[PDB]
């Protein structure tokens, strides 16, 4: 018997990325249930600003039983439900690719255009035709989102959602 929506603590050990989903486990280190194990997964947010973790498979040591309380988690000493990681991984790469390809396109066309008004023509050659295909490929790949990633050694706090026997 556990009252609805109480707060306990667990320790998260299994670090996983928010791109290829899988089971994740945590373990309670205090409270009435001590050393109890908890398996679940994550969800993907709409934007990369936070991360919440779905836990539903709870087991208590001693007996051969496996209960199914589905509950969520909160960050101790921050009291927010985001993730302590980095999110700035995949802005600068695609930005640099786009700017490089575009600058190449402009270099070829304009320095060929203002020839009225050999190696410089070779620069025109190179940037002129490597610009276009690289530009459309970068425009293809630009929409890949940034991933967040949970850590392997951060403790966590758990709220309950429903009750158990």
């Amino acid at each position: 018997i556990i009252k609805t929506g109480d707060i306990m603590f667990a320790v998260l050990d299994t670090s996983v990325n928010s791109d290829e989903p899988g089971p994740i486990l945590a373990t309670i280190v205090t409270g009435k249930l001590k050393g109890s194990k908890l398996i679940g997964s994550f969800n993907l947010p709409s934007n990369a600003d936070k991360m919440v973790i779905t836990f539903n498979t709870m087991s208590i040591p001693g007996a051969e039983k496996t209960i199914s309380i589905s509950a969520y988690a909160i960050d101790p000493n921050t009291a927010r439900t985001a993730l302590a990681s980095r999110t700035n991984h995949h802005y600068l790469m695609r930005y640099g690719s786009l700017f490089a390809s575009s600058f190449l396109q402009g270099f070829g066309n304009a320095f060929q255009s203002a020839n009225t008004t050999s190696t410089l023509e070779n620069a025109v050659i190179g940037l002129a035709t490597v610009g276009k295909a690289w530009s459309q490929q970068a425009q293809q790949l630009f929409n890949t989102p940034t991933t967040v990633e949970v850590y392997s050694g951060t403790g966590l706090g758990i709220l309950f959602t429903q009750d158990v026997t």
Partner: protein, 78 residues
């Protein structure tokens, strides 16, 4: 921590006495086995002089010694 300090050194732990023997033939004041004559006057634990701790996972915050007694200080407060 040198038990034969200003003496020879450790020879062997007589487990019939629980204590070591220094090179000069005297029992040092260090022990080496759990079974030895100690002098305990202060103790830890709770639910003493009773049935120990009843191992039931209690929903309530109070604890019960297995002879039926309940200890407020071993329990919590509200």
């Amino acid at each position: 921590d040198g038990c034969c300090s200003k003496m020879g050194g450790i020879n062997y732990c007589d487990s019939s006495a629980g204590r070591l023997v220094c090179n000069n033939g005297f029992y040092s004041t260090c022990y080496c086995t759990r079974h030895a004559v100690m002098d305990l006057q202060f103790l830890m634990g709770c639910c003493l002089w009773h049935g120990g701790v009843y191992p039931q996972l209690n929903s309530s915050g109070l604890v019960v010694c297995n002879d039926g007694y309940v200890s407020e200080e071993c329990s919590l407060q509200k």
